[PDB]
Write an enzyme that holds these catalytic residues in place. Structure first.
Site, mmCIF file in Angstrom:
data_model
loop_
_atom_site.group_PDB
_atom_site.id
_atom_site.type_symbol
_atom_site.label_atom_id
_atom_site.label_comp_id
_atom_site.label_asym_id
_atom_site.label_seq_id
_atom_site.Cartn_x
_atom_site.Cartn_y
_atom_site.Cartn_z
ATOM 1 N N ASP A 90 -1.587 12.614 3.768
ATOM 2 C CA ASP A 90 -2.874 12.493 3.245
ATOM 3 C C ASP A 90 -3.831 13.797 3.075
ATOM 4 O O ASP A 90 -4.657 14.121 2.394
ATOM 5 C CB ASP A 90 -3.483 11.064 3.404
ATOM 6 C CG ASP A 90 -2.835 9.972 2.764
ATOM 7 O OD1 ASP A 90 -2.294 9.179 3.593
ATOM 8 O OD2 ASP A 90 -2.547 9.785 1.621
ATOM 9 N N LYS A 116 1.032 -1.604 9.559
ATOM 10 C CA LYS A 116 1.172 -0.517 8.887
ATOM 11 C C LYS A 116 0.835 0.636 9.807
ATOM 12 O O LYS A 116 1.385 1.953 9.710
ATOM 13 C CB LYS A 116 0.320 -0.411 7.600
ATOM 14 C CG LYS A 116 0.020 0.764 6.803
ATOM 15 C CD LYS A 116 1.081 1.208 6.203
ATOM 16 C CE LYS A 116 0.831 2.559 5.381
ATOM 17 N NZ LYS A 116 1.904 3.360 4.772
#
Lengths: 173, 173
Positions: A90, A116
């Site tokens: 990202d 996650k």
């Protein structure tokens, strides 16, 4: 009407999403859609891009605007790392011989949040040794979030934008 | 006997904790204790130090060996940042005008994991603007772990060390 929902989404995009240049391309991609399912998909991407840029700014790195891979990032700075998994971070920042790599996400339950966080941690950890042999020290950052809030949108507008996207999803269900 | 437990903890420390120089001081502090409650406290610190060093290595930064504050870290590199909260990171790395700050923790439930991740995130976020005015860009890293495992100890030895510390805690309860 679905046209009324689309028109409301348009006005939110233009009037209530901060005019940061890094959002311009995705705002335009969103505004160019007229089909409900395409407005929905581009709207999800737009809200995701707000969160990613917000995470890159908070993490002190550069948002990965053009979805470059780790392989690509290193090549562009004159660093050869042959045989490396496909990872699109990202955010990133190549500083001296240190490579800051940023992964961000949103999860709404503590159990999915932790699952996650561990997955994103392992994803980045997989390339530490591969980078180390190419003289580069990995600085892996995992930014987990509990909601979809970001600095580019007031909270009410972010909520309304999600409410309108849901109505568009129902229209296409 | 409590002396038998202490003797077992001693042998684990010496034979099964990897001989990394950054652990030497704490291993010696631990080995110098003869009182059960002091053996327990130094044993918890020893296992915590293994995790912190492991996190600093995985995060590409330097373990904060001498518990220096952010204020102290910047002063030692010729950076003046006046009026700054007392923060002692687990790790740090001042590279160019970027300050990598590392916080690590262990939590055993997903709800406590997420609560602690958000607290550590906010703790570091509080100094971003204060550092920014002193020309330094914060690179905040929060490393959340789900267990007490680390690279300096085999899993069985880490479990036995915790089992022996618990028996020492029961002896002092």
């Amino acid at each position: 009407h679905h046209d009324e929902i689309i028109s409301e989404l348009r006005e939110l995009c233009l009037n209530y999403i901060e005019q940061d240049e890094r959002l311009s391309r995705q705002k335009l991609n969103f505004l160019g859609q007229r089909e409900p399912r395409m407005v929905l998909i581009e709207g999800l991407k737009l809200l995701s891009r707000c969160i990613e840029i917000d995470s890159a700014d908070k993490s002190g790195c550069t948002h990965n605007h053009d979805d470059k891979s780790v392989e690509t990032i290193l090549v562009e700075s004159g660093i050869v790392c042959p045989g490396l998994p496909l990872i699109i971070p990202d955010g990133y920042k190549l500083i001296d011989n240190s490579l800051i790599l940023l992964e961000c996400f949103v999860r709404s339950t503590p159990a999915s949040f932790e699952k996650k966080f561990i997955e994103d941690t392992n994803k980045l950890a997989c390339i530490r040794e591969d980078l180390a042999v190419a003289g580069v020290t990995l600085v892996p950052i995992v930014d987990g979030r509990c909601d979809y809030d970001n600095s580019f949108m007031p909270e009410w507008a972010n909520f309304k934008f999600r409410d309108l996207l849901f109505k568009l999803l129902e229209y296409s269900n």
